[PDB]
Write a structure and sequence with these properties.
Keywords (chain D): Amyloid, Amyloidosis, Disease variant, Disulfide bond, Glycation, Glycoprotein, Immunity, Immunoglobulin domain, MHC I, Pyrrolidone carboxylic acid, Secreted, Signal
Number of helices of chain E: 4
Number of strands of chain B: 21
Radius of gyration of chain E: 23 Å
Family (chain D): Belongs to the beta-2-microglobulin family.
CATH architecture of the largest domain in chain B: Sandwich
Subcellular location (chain D): Secreted; Cell surface
Order of helices and strands of chain B: EEEEEEEEEEEEEHEEEEEEHEE
GO cellular component, one term (chain D): Golgi membrane
Distance between the termini of chain E: 37 Å
CATH superfamily of the largest domain in chain E: MHC class I-like antigen recognition-like
CATH class of the largest domain in chain E: Alpha Beta
CATH superfamily of the largest domain in chain B: Immunoglobulins
Protein name (chain D): Beta-2-microglobulin
Number of strands of chain E: 17
Radius of gyration of chain B: 22 Å
Oligomer: heteropentamer
CATH topology of the largest domain in chain E: Murine Class I Major Histocompatibility Complex, H2-DB, Chain A, domain 1
Structural class of chain E: alpha+beta
Helix content of chain B: under 10%
Order of helices and strands of chain E: EEEEHEEEEHHHEEEEEEEEE
Distance between the termini of chain B: 54 Å
C-alpha cells in the first residue's frame, strides 16, 4: 500500500 | 486569511445552496466541517491538492469542486434532512498539517417563509427596590418572537455603544419546543450606578439587528415583510 | 486513528489550576490545540512535534508525551476569560486532521459580597408589564428551568462592571400569566435562604 | 538535462534447442529520457506480436524495459534487436548470438 | 533472508500539449505486483502478481484514489520545477520518485527510502536517519525549507517504520510460495577462441532468484577488474534472472583462472574452473 497523504515540491 | 461569506444564511427546504470559502494564504489543502449546537466538528469533504477531493465522515448530500487553489465551494443539496448547522471551512499549507479556520456560516433551513418574524424589543426600568438596597441599578432588555435565531443585540448610552456592565444570554429560548420552527426570545442586562440612572439627561437604548428575508423573497401576507432590520426600545433616567 | 479527549465538561473556580488530556494508541507525527467560542471559528493555539516538548501561551502550558501518543493542556490560575471549548487534533494518514471531541471549560467568578435578591422591573412604555430579576447570588447557585410552559426563565450569566471590580450573576424570568409574580418565579430553583424579596 | 544511451541485450529465456518452444528477449536499460522504440526482428523484418514490461527504474534513476516474443529457434533462422533513442544516431541493431 | 517493498513513480511532461504521463509500479523484492498507467483505459491501480489478486474491492479503490492524488501532485510539481529553473514550456521534462522500506530476516524494519530526481539527477532525498534532507541544489533548497516548516519528514518516518512495514509482511505471507522461494543459479563455462594467442573465458549464472548475485573472476590467485567485463543482471522473463562475467586470457593459461559465484540459493560460494 501507498501513502494516503500527498504534498507538493 | 481565510474568508467565507455570508455570516448568516437562510433557505427554504428543497433549495440547493453553495457556500463560499476563499483563502490567499497560499495553502494547498482545504476542508469543510459542520457543527451542531454544543457538539464538536464533523468532516464533510476535503481536498489535499487542486483538482482532487475526497469524502469525509459525513459526506452524503453534499458536493465540492476544487478547480482553483484558492477556492473550495460547498454545495448543500436536498441531502439528508439535517442541513441546518454552523459550517466552518479551514485550510493548511499541506494536507495533514495545522489548519486555520474561517469565521463560519450559520445556515438555517425553514419549512416555509411564512415562519419568519422580526423581534419585538422592550426595556424594563430598574426596580427602585434595587436602587436603595444596592446603590446599583439593572435594566433588562427582552427581544421576543423572532425566527430565525439570527440576531445581534447591543446597548447604547447617550449615542455610544457600551460593553461594560452588560451581559447577554449565550443562547436563546424556544417559545414553543413542540413546533419544528418555533420562534425565540433573548434577554440582556445593563447595570449602572444609582446616580447614573437617576440623572434625567441619561438615555438608554437596546438594539437588535435582525437577519431575515431578502428583497427578492416573495411576500404575500398581511403583516409587513420580515426583512433584515433593526428593532429598538428606550428609556430615560428617572427624577426620583 | 483515534484521539480521545477527557473530560467532556469541567467547571471550576477562578484562580484554580487544571489539566486536560488527549490520548491515542498510536504515534502522531505532529499535534495541535484549538480554542473555540460559540458561533466563531476555532483559534489555533499551538503545534507540537517532539516527544516530551513543552510550550507556553499566556496561562496555558501544553506538553507532547514522550512516545508521541498523547498531549496535555494545563491552565495555571484560570480566569473567567479562559472559558471556551478546547480541541486537540493530529496528522491523519489520509491527508486530514484527526480531532478529539473537545473539552468544555467554565471558569466562574468568586463573589465578594453576595446579596441574593429578586426584583420586579416595570416596562418603560407599559408601566408594570414585568420581568423578575434573580441577582447577586454566589456561583454555586443553579437556576432551574421552568416547571411551567408560559413561564420563561434564562440560564445564569455573569456581568462585569469593569470599573468597580464587581462581578455579578443574574437570571431573568417573565410571563403573560395571571398568577405570575416574583415571589414564585424561581420556586423550582434551590435559592439561598436569606434571599431578599422586597415587600 | 543529461542523457544516457540504452544498453541492449538479446537472449533467450531458456537454453535454446532447435524445435523447442522458447521466448526471445530484448533487455534495454540505463537510458535517459524514458521515450524509447524497440523492435525485434526475424530474418530482418518486424515481428508484430511483441510485448513489454511496465516502465520501471533502478536506484540509480535510469530506466529499464524487457521486450519479449514467443519463438521456436531453427538452425537457419537469424534473430536480432532493433532499438532507437534520442542519443542514437540512427537505430542500433544487435544480433542474437547463441551464447549470449 | 531480507526483504523490501518499493514504489517507483515516473512523471513526464509533454507540452504542445498535453497531459503529462504518469506511471507507477510496485515491487516486493524483485517481483512486480501492481501498476498504474495514466494512458491505459482503466484508470485504476491494477494487479501484476497472482497473490495480490486476493485483495478486496476496498483495497483496489483505496489504491486507485491514492495514486490519482499522487498523479495530480506531480502535475503541479512539473509546473513548479519549470519555474524554479526558468525553463520554457516547449521542453519535455522528467520527475522520478522512489519510496519504500527494508526488513531483515526477522521481518522488523531495517531501512527506509524517500527521494526524487529531476531530468535523471538527484533532486531531494530523505536521509537514512529519516529526519533530515539532502537538497542537491538551490531550487531543491526551496523544497527542503517548505518541507521543514510543515514537518513532512516526521510523517514519512512514521509511515516507513510502521504502515510500510506492515504492508510488506502481509504481502510476504499472501504470496508465501512466490516471494519466499530462493532459486540457486545453474552455472557453466564457455571458452571462445577470440584472437589466436587470446581466449574468452565466460562464466554463466542462470535461473536464479532473487536478482542479487556476485560473479567474480580470479587469476591464481586473486580478484581482478583488470580486464573483467560484466553485464547487468537481466530478467529471464519467467520470474528468474541471468548474468555473465567474462575475462580475456592469454591462450594456454585458462587453467590459472577460476570463477566465483555468491547467491542466497548457494549454501556456500561456487568455484568453477574450465573443463577440457
Amino acid at each position: 500500500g501507498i501513502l494516503g497523504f500527498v504534498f507538493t515540491l | 486569511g481565510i474568508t467565507q461569506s455570508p455570516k448568516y444564511l437562510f433557505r427554504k427546504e428543497g433549495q440547493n445552496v453553495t457556500l463560499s470559502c476563499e483563502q490567499n494564504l497560499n495553502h494547498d489543502a482545504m476542508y469543510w466541517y459542520r457543527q451542531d449546537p454544543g457538539q464538536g466538528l464533523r468532516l464533510i469533504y476535503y481536498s489535499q491538492i487542486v483538482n482532487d477531493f475526497q469524502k469525509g465522515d459525513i459526506a452524503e448530500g453534499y458536493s465540492v469542486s476544487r478547480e482553483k487553489k484558492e477556492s473550495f465551494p460547498l454545495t448543500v443539496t436536498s441531502a439528508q434532512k439535517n442541513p441546518t448547522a454552523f459550517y466552518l471551512c479551514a485550510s493548511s499549507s499541506r494536507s495533514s498539517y495545522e489548519q486555520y479556520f474561517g469565521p463560519g456560516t450559520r445556515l438555517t433551513v425553514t419549512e416555509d417563509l411564512k415562519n419568519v418574524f422580526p423581534p419585538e424589543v422592550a426595556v424594563f426600568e430598574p426596580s427602585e427596590a434595587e436602587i436603595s438596597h444596592t446603590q446599583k441599578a439593572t435594566l433588562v432588555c427582552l427581544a421576543t418572537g423572532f425566527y430565525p435565531d439570527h440576531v445581534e443585540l447591543s446597548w447604547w448610552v447617550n449615542g455610544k455603544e457600551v460593553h461594560s456592565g452588560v451581559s447577554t444570554d449565550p443562547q436563546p429560548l424556544k417559545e414553543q419546543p413542540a413546533l419544528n420552527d418555533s420562534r425565540y426570545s433573548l434577554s440582556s442586562r445593563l447595570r449602572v450606578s444609582a446616580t447614573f440612572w437617576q440623572n434625567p439627561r441619561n438615555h438608554f437604548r437596546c438594539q437588535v439587528q435582525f437577519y431575515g428575508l431578502s428583497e427578492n423573497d416573495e411576500w404575500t401576507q398581511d403583516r409587513a415583510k420580515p426583512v433584515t432590520q433593526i428593532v429598538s426600545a428606550e428609556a430615560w433616567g428617572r427624577a426620583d | 486513528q483515534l484521539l480521545e479527549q477527557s473530560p467532556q465538561f469541567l467547571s471550576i473556580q477562578e484562580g484554580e489550576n487544571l489539566t486536560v488530556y488527549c490520548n491515542s494508541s498510536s504515534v502522531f507525527s505532529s499535534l495541535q490545540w484549538y480554542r473555540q467560542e460559540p458561533g466563531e471559528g476555532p483559534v489555533l493555539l499551538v503545534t507540537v512535534v517532539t516527544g516530551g516538548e513543552v510550550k507556553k501561551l499566556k496561562r496555558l502550558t501544553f506538553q507532547f508525551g514522550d512516545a508521541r501518543k498523547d498531549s496535555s493542556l494545563h491552565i495555571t490560575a484560570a480566569q473567567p476569560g479562559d472559558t471556551g471549548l478546547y480541541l486537540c487534533a493530529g496528522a491523519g494518514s489520509q491527508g486530514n486532521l484527526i480531532f478529539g471531541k473537545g473539552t468544555k471549560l467554565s471558569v466562574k467568578p468568586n463573589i465578594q459580597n453576595p446579596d441574593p435578591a429578586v426584583y420586579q422591573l416595570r416596562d418603560s412604555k407599559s408601566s408594570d408589564k414585568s420581568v423578575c430579576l434573580f441577582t447577586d447570588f454566589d456561583s454555586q447557585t443553579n437556576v432551574s428551568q421552568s416547571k411551567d410552559s408560559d413561564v420563561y426563565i434564562t440560564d445564569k450569566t455573569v456581568l462585569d462592571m469593569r470599573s468597580m471590580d464587581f462581578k455579578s450573576n443574574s437570571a431573568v424570568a417573565w410571563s403573560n400569566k395571571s398568577d405570575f409574580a416574583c415571589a414564585n418565579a424561581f420556586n423550582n430553583s434551590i435559592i439561598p435562604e436569606d434571599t431578599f424579596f422586597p415587600s | 538535462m543529461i542523457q544516457r544511451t540504452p544498453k541492449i541485450q538479446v537472449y533467450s529465456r531458456h537454453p535454446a534447442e532447435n524445435g523447442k518452444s522458447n521466448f526471445l528477449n530484448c533487455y534495454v536499460s540505463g537510458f535517459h529520457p524514458s521515450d524509447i522504440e524497440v523492435d525485434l526482428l526475424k530474418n530482418g523484418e518486424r515481428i508484430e506480436k511483441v510485448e513489454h514490461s511496465d516502465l520501471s527504474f533502478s536506484k540509480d534513476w535510469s530506466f529499464y524495459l524487457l521486450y519479449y516474443t514467443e519463438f521456436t529457434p531453427t538452425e537457419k533462422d537469424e534473430y536480432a534487436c532493433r532499438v532507437n533513442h534520442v542519443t542514437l544516431s540512427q537505430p542500433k541493431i544487435v544480433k542474437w548470438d547463441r551464447d549470449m | 533472508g531480507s526483504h523490501s517493498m518499493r514504489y517507483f513513480f515516473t512523471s513526464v511532461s509533454r507540452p504542445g500539449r498535453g497531459e503529462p504521463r504518469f506511471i507507477a509500479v510496485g515491487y516486493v523484492d524483485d517481483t512486480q505486483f501492481v501498476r498504474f498507467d495514466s494512458d491505459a483505459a482503466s484508470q485504476r491501480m491494477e494487479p501484476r502478481a497472482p497473490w495480490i489478486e486476493q485483495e478486496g474491492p476496498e483495497y483496489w479503490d483505496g489504491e486507485t484514489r491514492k495514486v490519482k492524488a499522487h498523479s495530480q501532485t506531480h502535475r503541479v510539481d512539473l509546473g513548479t520545477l519549470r519555474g524554479y529553473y526558468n525553463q520554457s514550456e516547449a521542453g519535455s521534462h522528467t520527475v522520478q520518485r522512489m519510496y519504500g522500506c527494508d526488513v531483515g530476516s526477522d521481518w522488523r524494519f531495517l531501512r527506509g527510502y524517500h527521494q526524487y530526481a529531476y531530468d535523471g539527477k538527484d533532486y531531494i532525498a530523505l536521509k537514512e536517519d529519516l529526519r533530515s534532507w539532502t537538497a542537491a541544489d538551490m531550487a531543491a533548497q526551496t523544497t527542503k525549507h517548505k518541507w521543514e516548516a510543515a514537518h513532512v519528514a516526521e510523517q514519512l518516518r512514521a509511515y516507513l517504520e510502521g504502515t510500510c512495514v506492515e504492508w510488506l509482511r502481509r504481502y510476504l505471507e499472501n504470496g508465501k510460495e512466490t516471494l519466499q522461494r530462493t532459486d540457486a543459479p545453474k552455472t557453466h563455462m564457455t571458452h571462445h577462441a577470440v584472437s589466436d594467442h587470446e581466449a574468452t573465458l565466460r562464466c554463466w549464472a542462470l535461473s536464479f532468484y532473487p536478482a542479487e548475485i556476485t560473479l567474480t573472476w580470479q587469476r591464481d590467485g586473486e580478484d581482478q577488474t583488470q580486464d573483467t567485463e560484466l553485464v547487468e543482471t537481466r530478467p529471464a522473463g519467467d520470474g528468474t534472472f541471468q548474468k555473465w562475467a567474462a575475462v580475456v586470457v592469454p591462450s594456454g593459461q585458462e587453467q590459472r583462472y577460476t570463477c566465483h559465484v555468491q547467491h542466497e540459493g548457494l549454501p556456500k560460494p561456487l568455484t568453477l574452473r574450465w573443463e577440457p
